[PDB]
Write a protein that binds this ligand. Sequence first.
Ligand code: A1CAV
Ligand code: ZN
Length: 109
Amino acid sequence: STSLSCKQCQETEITTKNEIFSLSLSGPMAAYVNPHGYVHETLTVYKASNLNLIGRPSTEHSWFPGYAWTVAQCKICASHIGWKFTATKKDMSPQKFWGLTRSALLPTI
Ligand SMILES: O=C1CC[C@H](N2Cc3c(ccc4c3OCC43CCNCC3)C2=O)C(=O)N1
Ligand SMILES: [Zn+2]
């Protein structure tokens, strides 16, 4: 229903609350530890748009075993919004989703 927009440029829709989903047995809203020990608050959604991808998928320090990650940035302002996760194996489900930085969106949830 509600849009989630890039907090930096404000006008740009990234996804909607009805794309919010739970992977495996995790809640949709979760915090994970980055390689330097920062606690990073994310939201998992099936679909997102107005994002560029940077770099190639990587499984290093993957918060989601089985999935690789690729940095995702706002197409308009280049602010880092989150990551695209893609499955490393063909029988996994889903094959793709997005883990977005909560604090990079508006409204903030
Ligand atoms: O599944 C997920 C999504 C990506 C998320 N990452 C990945 C990552 C984050 C921060 C810094 C870095 C990084 O890899 C590259 C690096 C570490 C080596 N030095 C350069 C910068 C970060 O937060 C993570 O740990 N897990
Ligand atoms: Zn933006």
